[PDB]
Amino acid sequence: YINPELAQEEKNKGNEYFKKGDYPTAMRHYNEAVKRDPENAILYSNRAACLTKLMEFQRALDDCDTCIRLDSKFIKGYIRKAACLVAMREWSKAQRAYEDALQVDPSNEEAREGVRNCLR
């Protein structure tokens, strides 16, 4: 059952615990946010960042694809995908994910720095 205000509230509990670095507890809240507004791309971007810190790389990249599917214009899905691949040391795939972001917005500074980071 869709509840987008509750999803927002849960997003924030998530983001807060993310920042005290208790990702276990942040994840409980990101899961609930996703449950309540499952078509909202940003919730998957957010959850992907957390899953990546936890080294749940398979689940992280699933969330990045979800984000990219739900909103192909939302740059952070591509950024989170690239960042996860950097965390995996998948450099060649990471470089292409950042380049996919740059296709969406060639002025994106985070993606341009990400390409620099991928030069080995």
Curated annotation (Swiss-Prot):
Induction: Up-regulated by heat stress (at protein level). Its main location: cytoplasm. Keywords: Cytoplasm, Developmental protein, Repeat, Stress response, TPR repeat. One of its GO terms (molecular function) is ATPase inhibitor activity. Disruption phenotype: Reduced brood size and decreased fertility under heat stress. Decreased thermotolerance and shortening of life span by 68% and 77% at 20 degrees Celsius and 25 degrees Celsius respectively. Growth of gonads is hampered resulting in shortened arms of the gonads, abnormally shaped spermathecae, lower sperm number and endomitotic oocyte development. Expressed ubiquitously in the whole body. Detected predominantly in the pharyngeal muscles, vulva epithelial cells, striated body-wall muscles, spermathecae and intestinal cell ring. Also observed in the tail regions of hermaphrodite and in the sensory rays and spicules of males. One of its GO terms (cellular component) is cytoplasm. TPR repeats lie at residues 7-40, 42-74, 75-108. It is found in: Cytoplasm. Coiled coil: none annotated. GO terms for biological process: determination of adult lifespan; reproductive process; response to heat. It comes from the Eukaryota. Plays a role in gonad development. Up-regulates longevity and thermotolerance. Binds daf-21/hsp90 and inhibits its ATPase activity. Forms a complex with hsp-1/hsp70 and daf-21/hsp90. Interacts with daf-21/hsp90 (via the C-terminal MEEVD pentapeptide). This is Stress-induced-phosphoprotein 1. It comes from Caenorhabditis elegans. The lineage of its organism: Eukaryota, Metazoa, Ecdysozoa, Nematoda, Chromadorea. The chain holds residues 134 to 253 of 320 of the full protein.
